[PDB]
Amino acid sequence: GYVGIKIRLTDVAPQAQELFKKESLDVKENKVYLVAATLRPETMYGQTCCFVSPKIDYGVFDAGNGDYFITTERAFKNMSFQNLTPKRGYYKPLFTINGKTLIGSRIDAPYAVNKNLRVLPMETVLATKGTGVVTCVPSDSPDDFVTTRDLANKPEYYGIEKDWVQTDIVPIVHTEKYGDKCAEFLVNDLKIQSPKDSVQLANAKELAYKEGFYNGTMLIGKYKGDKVEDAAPKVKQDLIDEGLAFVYNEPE
Ligand SMILES: Nc1ncnc2c1ncn2[C@@H]1O[C@H](COP(=O)(O)O)[C@H]2O[B@-]3(OCc4cc(F)ccc43)O[C@H]21
């Protein structure tokens, strides 16, 4: 399974405003969330944006009790089978929305120390994995770092504005092998120049995880100074207790 991170949609992008208005779904009154799937809840302090795929047609689903989730239909269907939605096996969204239509939207990500976060495009989101929504932690995720780099280097070309992408990375996890921004270290060390270098990125991802999780120390938050291995389950439970996240499993 995954930890679903409830990223609050505070302001919708101009191209999506006419869509949300037609549905009578005010993001100021109602709680509309992009639900990002993560296995690294301890890294939520370093969220710099939320990624959606331009290729994916997301659903806006009734999550019950005034909540609304933006995910793939596959993911929401899975959530319905484990008491996270109003009705078991019901997964028709209120409406469908392409990832491109959400780009530029403003969001509030749980535990993120950086402010003024935006929804940005990620071309390499695997549509059949998790929720199809990926939160961006460039300090420790090689995929997120390489995607952020390309967006920051040619923002207008990528259909975004300069101020929407954040490059001033706040360190979250200290490591002995790769310093305090292991993803930056590893992307440079392995000379990964494109987000589509899947084989090398998978290598970097695993190296970053093993060192950061098993040997890393938290640099921020309630568990600053603690080993990541000890802190991670505590951060996860805190997020769940505070209504900012939840766990959900998949078939098989
Ligand atoms: N549909 C998708 N397409 C591409 N990537 C996706 C995705 N859904 C989630 N992810 C990414 O893969 C991680 C789980 O890795 P495995 O399952 O073990 O491969 C998740 O945790 B992680 O979230 C924040 C984070 C920080 C970090 F320092 C490292 C990783 C992540 O990035 C997410």
DSSP secondary structure string for all residues of the chain: -EEEEEEEEEE--HHHHHHHHHTT--TTTSEEEEEEEES-GGGGGG--EEEE-TT-EEEEEEEETTEEEEE-HHHHHHHHTTTSSSSTT----SEEEEHHHHTT-EEE-TT--S-SEEEEE-TT--TTSTTSEEEE-TTT-HHHHHHHHHHHHSTTTTT--GGGS---PPP-EEBTTTBT-HHHHHHHHTT---TT-HHHHHHHHHHHHIIIIIH-EE-SSTTTTSBHHHHHHHHHHHHHHTTSEEEE----
The resolution of the experimental structure, rounded to one decimal in Å, is 1.5
Residue 121 token pair: 């495009």
- Do 16 and 84 form a contact (C-beta atoms < 8 A)? no
| Ligand 1 neighbourhood includes 71 CB (under 6 angstroms) | no
By the 10 Å C-beta count (0-12 exposed, 13-18 middle, 19+ buried), 49 is classed as: buried
Out of 34, 55, 141, mutate this one to test ligand 1's pocket (max ligand atoms within 8 Å of CB): namely 141
34 CA to centre of ligand 1 in angstroms: 15
Question: What φ, ψ does residue 46 adopt, rounded to 5°?
Answer: -100, 25
* Ligand 1 within 6 A of CB of 38: yes
Walk me through the domains of the chain, giving residue ranges and CATH numbers: 1-252 (3.90.740.10)
Q: Could you tell me if the CB of 195 is within 6 A of ligand 1?
A: no
Q: Are 12 and 22 in contact (CB under 8 A)?
A: no
Query: Do the Cβ atoms of 13 and 112 come closer than 8 Å?
Result: no
